[PDB]
């Protein structure tokens, strides 16, 4: 049974230029635009997802991540986690339903690494553009731009990863899948946590400046889709960070590229199938 | 988080000739043999899995499945589930630890469909044959025979699917991902159940005879692997049921073939990513064909 | 060097309904329409080919193939081939330039199996839509319907395949790549012929009826494009013959399906790389 | 019909250590060893090819390529080519048959770029390890190391590429498929030549030093095989030049890596289907400067 925290639900990122951000995410990445609110933020969802949104961009004077939200099983679970976060010593804030289009109230809190995390139980299901009866495997949207399958996770750069692990494993029901060791001084320089049977729903790398966003990740169907994504990036003049390649950690075959505003994102596929009862895999600093 | 029933743990199948069963499953399908007990049962597991076994064969008068077990989160969970099963009205049997090689105690019970289901919390962890520190992407095992990644699920044939569904969803925390409706005067002729975010961990099809096994399924990495599996089957003159194709119900790209004793198995990959908050997908009986084989 | 007969140039097929044929080939298979003549024929080419046409449709009262042409190196070669065919004992007809849109004169003749074959040295090159300078990876045409890369070959059914083989190898410059032996008759039941280094540019199977067409084939880029083609066929309710699979002969991974008129076409990829110095592979009849 | 020069036939490369060279080529790249002659050379062929050899290694003081040869249709063609090569103004030297294991005599000559090219019509056929009757699509060989399918081509670095182009297109029956234009004093800084319907059978890049070998190339079955090759390289600590990536000057998806001796080779798949009647594609120098075959890089 999947319970408690289910999956990454949304990432709100800052773009130095809205209209340009809308163009790149709609035509290059191929996210489906679902709405635009009064604040001027525009909502997107991957084609095969069913909820109203997973990626929200906001015009601002600085690039980066405002916050990262997770969907939880139900309202009861949301209330419990809220109380658990507080019992743990974290101060929670409650964002009202509607504050974000088609989204219920959210429980927000700040990690020691400086990042803002949200938890919510409700978000309107809009569907994946395919009928619920005798559904096709895909439709035209699958080939509009890169067209990723789902918001897979994000990797965050922050100062107190050690205590961040505790919050996630002891309060949020996540578990360590992989980690990178420090130079023998044995302190996880980085961690890959899962709250399902995926290699990771979120990751953290130890960093001096808090609240930094390394990248938001989008899942693709096959290695050939990663190849196609690279061609679309090239044809649209997208600034690529590190070309298509196999990633040691999580066995991911990915591509790192930057959007107009300088936000790094990933399109990948691959990875094993860990479960709560598995012991994490480790990587020596020299390998990292 | 993944709690309660985590995933398919093992399937013990009956084979006519134990020796050919070993050869086929070790050399053709590519399972890693991990043991043989005193009752004459050989233990296999997929190379990338970590637990001691997921597939166990036994020489018997007839082919088919003896039982299908699921691994649960923890002992407290095992005891808890066993309690709810009884409180539900199902009589449960307690199989002691060790009865199965490298396996802990299991909670076994029979379904309305006639199939025997087990629940267990402990199974020795042997690893995937790759190092725990700075692991390689894969190894030679990945190319020994078909070499599937995990026991994905199984599809069972038996009566009273409606009742079977209620047990899985109301007691074992599963949820319906897809169903194939009966003709008019609706009811479900087929159901695909998930206890995770996989399209299905197990499925049932309404059939008059009970305790029947349609197939056990093994997960592959890609579509090219599915074609490779096809070639390997041909090279070993393995009887293939439905060649490489797309399902529709699950979107799974697969191939069905038979082992030497007539037991159908499957090697596939693909599918979307359902979660418990999702509403099930429905297929009409009239459009059943496309649901079973999409391209055709 | 590639000389003599270079490659399959065009197949003109008969459709029971021009309208349904235009829609099917242009939007399901994803061929690119390049013209229509005052005779009511529609011209198509695969998007990545450079010549004006490779597949022509003509509304008639019966499905099937009218003729199949091959492009040769140059005019001198065309004349040479015409002379050799007649010196061989065959009667030739010369079709003038322009009888077919954007096409030069053609040399036509009938095979003992009843099929009409043509040879031509000139056909307007129109390009693949991509620039000849710094060509972008690929365009949108790549994903318009199935979108095959080239007319790969055709498979013809008819009698006297033995006589047909001699004409192609002794006169036209092809060589036998693969064969299916007949049941102790010491006469091949099927032949796969190449005039390049492709597994085959044309193939014949022994059959009582004369001039029959089994299928025209189109090449795809990968096994996954084959899966995609099947998906597209299902989506457009296309009637599929043999599901995605691998051919023993050629090693090709394919799908056979029918157009609205009952004409079988193929979408496949794969196969080894034979050369004129290679010996043919053989398949026992009992292992067809 | 495929006539005249048919395809790359063999490449003899120099390795600093004959032993580690044999292990790398039979275990990592997955080439099939077919022999070892008196001179100390070890011969290999790709599993799916049918002739005795396509890659030969020779222990030497320096790394690089000794010569690159093409197989021609038949003996008559070999004689004709030799005559046309001399008629053109090149001096040719006939290498005796048997000088190379299982290889007939060869017509050797030097290009203006300094590279030695050979032509031969006969080389013993040893098969691809698969039955000639009811042949399977592949076997264990396909999964031994990377296991390339064929010696696809090579890319040489040397001067006077203009004169090399003339020789290949006017005498050897090849044609230009792609080119890289010079910054502006227009000419060609790079050329990709074909003697078939492949994107290229051989390529040259204008470079001051004569006889330079950029890389020999090996063809793979699919994009996933390239990814696989990447994993095998990482596992064997192979020195990778430029990881899996989409080319451009061929639409190829490839990986450039090095021999333990420092010989660069390529494992790729992909590309379109040019024919003799086609006009070449062009790349601006500034584009080439960002590609994988740029002298700097
Ligand atoms: C520091 C860094 O980028 C590591 C990322 C790990 C992953 O598994 C992925 O990106 O899929
Ligand atoms: C027609 C039928 O029985 C269902 C086929 C779909 C499946 O996902 C399976 O068998 O695992
Ligand atoms: C006569 C028949 O059914 C088999 C044909 C084999 C092939 O490889 C093809 O058609 O490309
Ligand atoms: Fe990532
Ligand atoms: Fe199944
Ligand atoms: Fe065909
Ligand atoms: Fe190359």
Coordinates of C-alpha atoms in Angstrom, one line a residue, chain C residues 1-249:
Chain C
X1 CA 30.6 2.2 -55.7
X2 CA 26.8 2.0 -56.3
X3 CA 26.2 1.7 -60.1
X4 CA 23.7 0.0 -62.4
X5 CA 20.3 -0.2 -60.7
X6 CA 20.5 1.9 -57.5
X7 CA 17.4 1.4 -55.6
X8 CA 13.6 1.0 -55.6
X9 CA 12.2 4.2 -57.2
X10 CA 8.5 3.9 -57.0
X11 CA 5.5 1.7 -56.6
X12 CA 2.2 2.7 -58.2
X13 CA -0.7 1.0 -56.4
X14 CA -4.4 0.8 -57.1
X15 CA -6.9 2.0 -54.5
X16 CA -10.7 1.4 -54.4
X17 CA -11.2 5.0 -53.1
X18 CA -8.8 7.8 -53.8
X19 CA -10.1 9.9 -51.0
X20 CA -9.6 7.3 -48.3
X21 CA -6.3 6.5 -49.8
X22 CA -5.1 10.1 -49.7
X23 CA -6.0 10.4 -46.0
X24 CA -4.5 7.1 -45.0
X25 CA -1.2 7.4 -46.7
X26 CA -0.8 11.1 -45.9
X27 CA -1.9 11.0 -42.3
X28 CA -1.7 7.4 -41.0
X29 CA 1.5 6.2 -42.7
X30 CA 2.8 9.7 -42.8
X31 CA 4.0 10.0 -46.4
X32 CA 4.4 13.4 -47.9
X33 CA 2.2 14.3 -50.9
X34 CA 4.2 15.9 -53.7
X35 CA 1.7 16.1 -56.5
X36 CA -1.3 15.1 -58.5
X37 CA -1.6 14.7 -62.3
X38 CA -4.3 15.3 -64.9
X39 CA -4.8 11.5 -64.7
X40 CA -6.0 11.5 -61.1
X41 CA -2.9 10.0 -59.5
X42 CA -1.5 11.2 -56.2
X43 CA 2.2 11.3 -55.6
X44 CA 4.0 10.6 -52.3
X45 CA 7.6 10.4 -51.1
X46 CA 8.9 9.4 -47.7
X47 CA 9.9 12.6 -45.8
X48 CA 13.6 11.8 -45.6
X49 CA 14.0 10.8 -49.3
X50 CA 15.1 13.4 -51.8
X51 CA 13.3 12.4 -55.0
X52 CA 9.8 13.7 -55.9
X53 CA 8.0 10.3 -55.5
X54 CA 8.3 6.7 -54.3
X55 CA 4.6 5.8 -54.0
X56 CA 1.8 6.6 -56.4
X57 CA -1.9 5.9 -55.9
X58 CA -4.5 5.5 -58.7
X59 CA -8.2 4.8 -58.1
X60 CA -9.3 1.7 -59.9
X61 CA -11.9 -1.1 -59.6
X62 CA -9.3 -3.6 -58.1
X63 CA -6.5 -3.2 -55.5
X64 CA -3.0 -4.3 -56.3
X65 CA 0.1 -3.1 -58.0
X66 CA 0.3 -1.6 -61.5
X67 CA 4.1 -1.4 -61.7
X68 CA 7.3 -1.1 -59.7
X69 CA 10.2 1.1 -60.9
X70 CA 13.9 1.2 -60.1
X71 CA 16.1 4.3 -60.4
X72 CA 19.4 3.7 -62.2
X73 CA 22.7 5.5 -62.0
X74 CA 22.4 7.6 -65.2
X75 CA 21.0 7.8 -68.7
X76 CA 23.8 5.8 -70.3
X77 CA 23.1 3.1 -67.7
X78 CA 19.4 3.2 -68.6
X79 CA 20.2 2.7 -72.3
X80 CA 22.6 0.0 -71.5
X81 CA 20.1 -1.9 -69.3
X82 CA 17.4 -1.5 -72.0
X83 CA 19.7 -3.1 -74.6
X84 CA 20.7 -6.0 -72.3
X85 CA 17.1 -6.8 -71.4
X86 CA 16.2 -7.1 -75.1
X87 CA 19.3 -9.0 -75.9
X88 CA 18.2 -11.3 -73.1
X89 CA 15.0 -12.1 -75.0
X90 CA 12.6 -9.6 -73.3
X91 CA 10.4 -7.1 -75.1
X92 CA 10.8 -3.5 -73.8
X93 CA 8.5 -0.4 -74.0
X94 CA 9.7 3.1 -73.6
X95 CA 7.5 5.5 -71.6
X96 CA 8.3 9.2 -72.3
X97 CA 9.5 11.8 -69.9
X98 CA 6.6 13.5 -68.1
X99 CA 4.0 10.8 -68.5
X100 CA 4.6 10.7 -64.8
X101 CA 4.9 14.0 -62.9
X102 CA 8.5 15.1 -62.4
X103 CA 9.9 11.9 -64.0
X104 CA 12.0 11.2 -67.0
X105 CA 11.6 8.4 -69.5
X106 CA 11.2 4.8 -68.3
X107 CA 12.0 1.4 -69.6
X108 CA 9.2 -1.0 -68.9
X109 CA 8.8 -4.8 -69.3
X110 CA 6.9 -7.7 -67.9
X111 CA 8.5 -10.5 -65.9
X112 CA 7.6 -14.2 -66.4
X113 CA 5.7 -13.8 -63.1
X114 CA 3.4 -11.2 -64.7
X115 CA 4.7 -8.1 -62.9
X116 CA 5.5 -4.9 -64.6
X117 CA 8.9 -3.5 -63.8
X118 CA 10.4 -0.1 -64.7
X119 CA 13.8 1.5 -64.9
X120 CA 14.4 5.2 -64.9
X121 CA 17.5 7.5 -64.6
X122 CA 15.8 10.8 -64.0
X123 CA 13.3 12.1 -61.4
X124 CA 13.3 15.6 -59.9
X125 CA 15.1 15.9 -56.6
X126 CA 12.9 18.0 -54.2
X127 CA 14.8 17.4 -51.0
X128 CA 13.7 16.4 -47.5
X129 CA 12.6 19.8 -46.3
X130 CA 15.8 20.2 -44.1
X131 CA 18.5 22.7 -45.2
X132 CA 21.6 21.5 -47.1
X133 CA 23.7 23.6 -44.8
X134 CA 23.9 22.8 -41.1
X135 CA 20.8 20.5 -41.3
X136 CA 18.9 20.6 -38.0
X137 CA 18.6 17.1 -36.4
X138 CA 15.1 16.5 -37.8
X139 CA 11.9 18.4 -38.4
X140 CA 8.2 17.8 -37.4
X141 CA 7.7 15.6 -40.4
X142 CA 9.6 13.0 -38.5
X143 CA 6.6 12.5 -36.2
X144 CA 3.7 13.1 -38.6
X145 CA 2.0 9.7 -38.5
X146 CA 4.2 6.6 -38.9
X147 CA 6.6 8.6 -41.1
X148 CA 8.8 6.0 -42.7
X149 CA 12.3 6.8 -44.1
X150 CA 12.2 5.2 -47.6
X151 CA 10.4 2.8 -49.8
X152 CA 12.5 -0.2 -48.9
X153 CA 11.2 -2.9 -51.2
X154 CA 8.2 -4.9 -52.2
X155 CA 7.3 -8.6 -52.2
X156 CA 5.7 -10.0 -55.3
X157 CA 3.8 -13.3 -55.8
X158 CA 3.8 -15.1 -59.1
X159 CA 4.9 -18.1 -61.1
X160 CA 8.3 -18.7 -62.7
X161 CA 10.3 -17.2 -59.9
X162 CA 13.3 -19.2 -61.2
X163 CA 13.2 -17.3 -64.5
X164 CA 12.6 -14.0 -62.6
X165 CA 15.8 -14.6 -60.5
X166 CA 17.9 -15.0 -63.7
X167 CA 16.7 -11.7 -65.2
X168 CA 17.6 -9.8 -62.0
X169 CA 21.0 -11.4 -61.4
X170 CA 22.2 -11.9 -65.0
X171 CA 20.7 -8.8 -66.5
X172 CA 19.9 -6.2 -63.8
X173 CA 22.9 -6.6 -61.4
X174 CA 21.1 -8.0 -58.4
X175 CA 22.4 -10.9 -56.3
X176 CA 20.6 -13.5 -54.2
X177 CA 20.8 -12.6 -50.4
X178 CA 18.4 -15.1 -49.0
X179 CA 16.3 -18.1 -50.2
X180 CA 13.6 -20.4 -49.1
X181 CA 14.1 -23.9 -50.5
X182 CA 11.1 -25.7 -51.9
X183 CA 10.1 -29.2 -50.6
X184 CA 12.8 -31.4 -52.3
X185 CA 12.2 -29.8 -55.7
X186 CA 15.6 -28.1 -55.8
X187 CA 13.8 -24.8 -56.8
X188 CA 13.6 -21.9 -54.4
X189 CA 10.0 -21.1 -53.2
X190 CA 11.2 -17.6 -52.4
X191 CA 14.0 -15.2 -53.2
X192 CA 15.3 -12.1 -51.6
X193 CA 17.3 -10.0 -54.1
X194 CA 19.6 -7.0 -53.5
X195 CA 21.2 -4.5 -56.0
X196 CA 23.1 -2.8 -53.2
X197 CA 24.1 -3.7 -49.6
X198 CA 20.6 -3.9 -48.2
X199 CA 19.1 -7.2 -47.2
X200 CA 16.9 -6.9 -50.2
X201 CA 15.5 -4.3 -52.6
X202 CA 12.9 -6.7 -54.0
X203 CA 11.6 -10.3 -53.3
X204 CA 9.5 -12.9 -55.0
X205 CA 7.6 -15.9 -53.8
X206 CA 6.3 -18.7 -56.1
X207 CA 2.5 -18.5 -56.5
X208 CA 0.0 -19.8 -59.1
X209 CA -1.6 -16.4 -59.8
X210 CA 0.4 -13.9 -61.9
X211 CA 1.2 -10.3 -61.1
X212 CA 0.1 -10.5 -57.5
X213 CA 1.4 -8.0 -54.8
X214 CA 2.1 -9.2 -51.3
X215 CA 3.3 -5.9 -50.0
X216 CA 5.3 -2.7 -50.4
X217 CA 7.6 -2.0 -47.5
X218 CA 8.7 1.1 -45.7
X219 CA 11.8 1.5 -43.4
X220 CA 11.6 2.9 -39.9
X221 CA 14.5 3.9 -37.7
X222 CA 14.2 1.6 -34.7
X223 CA 12.4 -1.3 -33.0
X224 CA 10.6 1.4 -30.9
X225 CA 9.4 3.2 -34.0
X226 CA 7.9 -0.2 -35.0
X227 CA 6.0 -0.3 -31.7
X228 CA 4.9 3.3 -32.3
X229 CA 3.7 2.4 -35.8
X230 CA 1.5 -0.4 -34.3
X231 CA 0.1 2.0 -31.8
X232 CA -0.8 4.5 -34.6
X233 CA -2.4 1.7 -36.6
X234 CA -4.6 0.8 -33.7
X235 CA -5.5 4.4 -33.1
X236 CA -6.7 4.8 -36.7
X237 CA -8.5 1.5 -36.6
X238 CA -6.1 0.1 -39.3
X239 CA -6.5 -3.6 -40.0
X240 CA -3.3 -5.3 -38.9
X241 CA -2.1 -8.6 -40.4
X242 CA 0.9 -9.8 -38.4
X243 CA 1.7 -8.0 -35.1
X244 CA 5.1 -6.5 -34.3
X245 CA 7.7 -9.3 -34.7
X246 CA 11.0 -10.3 -36.2
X247 CA 11.3 -12.0 -39.6
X248 CA 13.6 -15.0 -39.7
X249 CA 14.6 -14.1 -43.2

